[PDB]
Amino acid sequence: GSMGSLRALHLVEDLRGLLEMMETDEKEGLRCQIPDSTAEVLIEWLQN
Amino acid sequence: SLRALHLVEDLRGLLEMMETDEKEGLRCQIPDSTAEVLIEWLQN
Ligand SMILES: [Ca+2]
């Protein structure tokens, strides 16, 4: 590991936590603003 | 929205610089319930 992957671990935890405080339209609106390329990298990493 | 957008961008930038063993070792440390929430959110 590294301090960068420790950072990544905390970003993931923060993102799940923030998602809990969002309403449906806010979560969809957030996802709508994320480039599909960024989403794809995250999906495949989580599904690997 | 701005903070979460930055979180997602920073995360993508970190993952793209990682070797395969680093990315997969990091995935090992993510709870399955967290991974499932994020996957379903990203795929809709
Ligand atoms: Ca499910």
- State the resolution, in angstroms: 1.7
Contact A46 B39 (CB under 8 A): yes
The domain total for chain B is: 1
Task: Name the token pair of B23.
Answer: 């990315």
Is A23 in contact with B36 (CB distance < 8 Å)? no
Contact B7 A18 (CB under 8 A): yes
Nearest CA to A13 out of B43, B19, B38 is that of B38
The dihedral built from the CA positions of residue B34, B40, B41 and B42, taken in this order, carries a sign that is: positive
Residue of A nearest to B20 (CA): A45
Contact B11 A13 (CB under 8 A): no
Contact list, A11 vs chain B (CB under 8 Å): 7, 10-11, 14
Task: Name the token pair of A40.
Answer: 């794809």
Residue A5: C-alpha distances to residues A22, A32, A42, A43, B14 (Å): 26, 26, 14, 17, 7
The whole-angstrom distance between residue A26's C-alpha and the CA centroid of its chain comes to: 14
d(C-alpha A9, C-alpha B15), whole Å:
11
Is B41 in contact with A23 (CB distance < 8 Å)? no
Task: Name the token pair of A18.
Answer: 């923030």
Task: Name the token pair of A34.
Answer: 């994320």
Determination method here? X-ray
Show the domain range for A24. 3-46
Which amino acid is located at A3 in the chain?
Answer: M
Half-sphere exposure of B24 toward its Cβ, with a 13 Å CA cutoff? 4
d(C-alpha A1, C-alpha B18), whole Å:
10
3-state secondary structure of B9: helix
